[PDB]
Structures are given as structure tokens and as C-alpha cells.
Symmetry: C3
């Protein structure tokens, strides 16, 4: 019923991404230094966590979206979100 | 009823901050290398996430506190907690 | 009933650790660049958060596991998980 969030950031400006799980849907809000805006991430789930890392200037983000006991990893590597190889046996 | 936590850290010592949402209140415990102590952060919410980054030696922390479907961003930039510009339309 | 996750990463490969709280047990899945595998972390709790930092090449991880209103810190410093000094008065 109530929302759950996860957050990551990179750089010095910085860039910030905030993921919100709300009523079974996870969405993304973005800051790149001047105004919040809506990101491309849209995936189902009731729970979210996130981590990210830089390779030089290139950001890589991994979002772990869970529904029930099933966790799906979503990957940003500069050119769209794709499903990752993560599995777990919950 | 049960608590929910979020954590961030910076440096090599390191500094650690742990935020706990408990019965609608979010509080902060701190480690700077020698003993845990209570931090200045006190804001309402049932859910918390956090991210942080360094600009040189200066730490910046962003805490995302949610109550119901409403998320408020709180900002530490070295001189007190202030409300951030984050909005979302949950 | 539904799982809750936390995630951290380090380096450029990168290394990723995903912690899952499920039915009162927290477990760990690991990525070091080529295949997911099960980590050594096994501790009780209904809620998990995590942070990590590098000292040179040496990773240090702190997992905050909560049951009810009681939070226990677990420490990885390269040679096994040990209970940390964290306390809180929830
Ligand atoms: O600039 C916004 C954006 O491209 O940033 C990287 C990822 O967070 C994307 O989902 C997002 O749309
Ligand atoms: O390039 C995608 C990928 O290999 O990135 C590292 C890990 O997140 C993997 O699960 C994932 O499939
Ligand atoms: O040294 C403790 C402290 O000043 O560290 C920075 C922020 O975490 C503050 O809320 C906190 O009181
Ligand atoms: O200086 C505060 C601020 O600009 O920092 C970056 C973002 O966290 C913004 O939402 C926030 O208002
Ligand atoms: O390579 C896996 C491993 O050793 O990595 C460091 C920690 O995450 C441990 O719990 C884990 O078993
Ligand atoms: O070496 C372990 C330890 O000192 O590391 C820093 C903090 O996580 C402390 O709570 C913890 O006991």
C-alpha cells in the first residue's frame, strides 16, 4: 500500500536515480544536476534495490525488482534496459 | 511494526550512516571510525533509502523518506539537513 | 511473505552482492564477472540493508540485518563474517 524506494548516485554533479515500488509497479525519477525528470525504467515489482558503478565515464546500473519471492535483475549499460542473468532460488 | 533500514558509507576509515524507519520516525546512527553515535537526522516516514557522494573531501547525503505514497528528499551538504527539490507523482 | 533485497557493488568488473530477506532468513548471491553463485552470508532477519567500501584492493562489507526492532551489523573484511559493534535503541 505504501511506497518503497531505492536510490543510487554517481559522479560529482551528481547524477541521482530514485526507484519507487508502488502498487506493484517500479518507476524511476532522475536528477542530472538541474531538475528532476522521469526515467525510462518501468518494470513490475513490489520491492526494489539498486546498485551502480562507473567504467570511466560510462554508468552501469542494476535494479533488483522482486514480486512475491521472485527477483529479476534489470540492466542499464547506456543503451536501454535489458534483463540480467541474476537468478536466486527463493 | 518491524524496522526498516538503509545504509551509506564514504571514505576509507570509513564513515557509515545507518537510517532506521521505526513506527513512522526515521533516525540516524553514525560511525566515523571509533564508536557509534546518534546523528542529527530526524524526519518522519515509514520507509527510507539513502545515497551519498563526495566532492573532494566534502560529503553530500540524500535521504528519501516516504510516508504512504509521498516521498520527501532530505539533504546534508555539510551544514544541516534541508528539504530537497525531489518530487514524484505517486 | 514477499522477499526484500539489498545490493552493493565494487570495482569495474564489477563484483555485485545481492542480499535477500525471505521468511526470516537473509542469504547472499554473488557476481564476480562470470556467473552468479551463492555467498557465505547466512544470518536471520526480516529486513536487510548493505554498504561497502574498498581500501586499496580490499573489500569491506557491512550488512544491517533487522528482526522486529533489533538491528545486528555483520562485517566482511576478507576473512569471514563477524558481528559488528553497531547498536541502536529502537
Ligand atoms: O537521463 C535519464 C536516463 O537515461 O538515465 C539513465 C537511466 O537511469 C535511464 O533509465 C534514464 O532514462
Ligand atoms: O551485461 C549484463 C550482466 O552480465 O552484467 C553483470 C551482471 O549484472 C549480470 O547478471 C548481467 O547479466
Ligand atoms: O558526525 C555526525 C553527522 O554530522 O554526520 C553527517 C550527517 O550524517 C549528520 O546527520 C550527522 O549528525
Ligand atoms: O542542493 C540540493 C539539491 O539541489 O541537491 C541535488 C538534488 O538532491 C536536489 O533535489 C536538491 O534540491
Ligand atoms: O566470493 C564470494 C564471497 O567470498 O565474496 C565476499 C563475501 O560476499 C562473501 O560472503 C562471499 O562468499
Ligand atoms: O572492524 C569492524 C568494525 O569496527 O568496522 C567498522 C564498523 O562497521 C564497526 O561497527 C565494526 O565493529
Amino acid at each position: 500500500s505504501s511506497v518503497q524506494t531505492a536510490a543510487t548516485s554517481w559522479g560529482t554533479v551528481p547524477s541521482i536515480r530514485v526507484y519507487t515500488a508502488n502498487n506493484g509497479k517500479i518507476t524511476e525519477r532522475c536528477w542530472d544536476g538541474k531538475g528532476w525528470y522521469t526515467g525510462a525504467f518501468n518494470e513490475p515489482g513490489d520491492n526494489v534495490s539498486v546498485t551502480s558503478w562507473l567504467v570511466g565515464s560510462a554508468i552501469h546500473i542494476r535494479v533488483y525488482a522482486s514480486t512475491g519471492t521472485t527477483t529479476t535483475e534489470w540492466c542499464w549499460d547506456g543503451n536501454g534496459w535489458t534483463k540480467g542473468a541474476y537468478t536466486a532460488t527463493n
